[PDB]
Design a protein around this ligand. Structure first.
Ligand SMILES: [Zn+2]
Ligand SMILES: [Zn+2]
Length: 215
């Protein structure tokens, strides 16, 4: 079930009753839309305010609920870029302290810096755990786990099958990235789906693929 917007710039495919993948062309970036009984929760918004606004507006209309929260999985422009939109609309922008301070350092408005190494959030019925596994794609990258579905949002820590290299490594810690991936595999031993930062949803295999890319 793939719902595109007017432009085809934004696309959402359903994973289950309450979890959707959002994908925007900026190179396609993935995030999640969590349809919860208390509103919509995004795992990552989009590249900039324009797309973040279109994203929110598309999901709010479709699901007939407000976006209440977003989880920002790292401070890169393409993840933090819609922060202005989130803050001015009173959408809670969750992040680790490190992501927030990187955002501030890079001139972005700050997300909450409320996430710890492991943080468990609950939005209505929807359970969400955020996990900082260590440095990888960036020093601050986190993953997001939906324990009710065993769905892992890998963000840019995790490369899709189609990714034949590590992408942008300017901010990366290619020595620690393998350990960070291991930390994810150790923590989540039973994974139903993994959503990479870009590309097609996969499973545990994407974490193995990322490991190989790191050799
Ligand atoms: Zn990045
Ligand atoms: Zn990304």
């Amino acid at each position: 079930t793939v719902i595109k917007n007017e432009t085809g710039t934004i696309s959402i495919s359903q994973l289950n009753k309450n979890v959707w993948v959002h994908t925007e062309l900026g190179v396609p970036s993935n995030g999640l839309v969590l349809n919860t009984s208390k509103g919509l929760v995004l795992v990552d918004s989009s590249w900039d305010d324009k797309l973040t606004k279109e994203l929110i507006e598309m999901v709010e209309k479709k699901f007939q609920k407000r976006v209440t929260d977003v989880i920002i999985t790292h401070a890169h422009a393409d993840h933090i870029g819609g922060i202005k939109t989130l803050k001015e609309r009173g959408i809670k922008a969750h992040s680790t302290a490190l992501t927030a301070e990187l955002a501030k350092k890079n001139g972005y408005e700050e997300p909450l810096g409320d996430l710890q190494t492991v943080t468990n959030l609950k939005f209505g019925n929807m359970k969400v755990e955020t996990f900082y596994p260590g440095k990888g794609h960036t020093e601050d990258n986190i993953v997001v786990w939906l324990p009710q579905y065993n769905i892992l949002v890998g963000g840019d820590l995790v490369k899709s099958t189609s990714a034949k290299d590590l992408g942008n490594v300017a901010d990366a810690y290619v020595n620690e990235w393998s350990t960070s991936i291991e930390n994810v595999l150790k923590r989540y031993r039973n994974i139903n789906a993994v959503v990479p930062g870009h590309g097609e949803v996969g499973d545990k295999g994407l974490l193995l693929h990322t490991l190989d890319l790191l050799k």
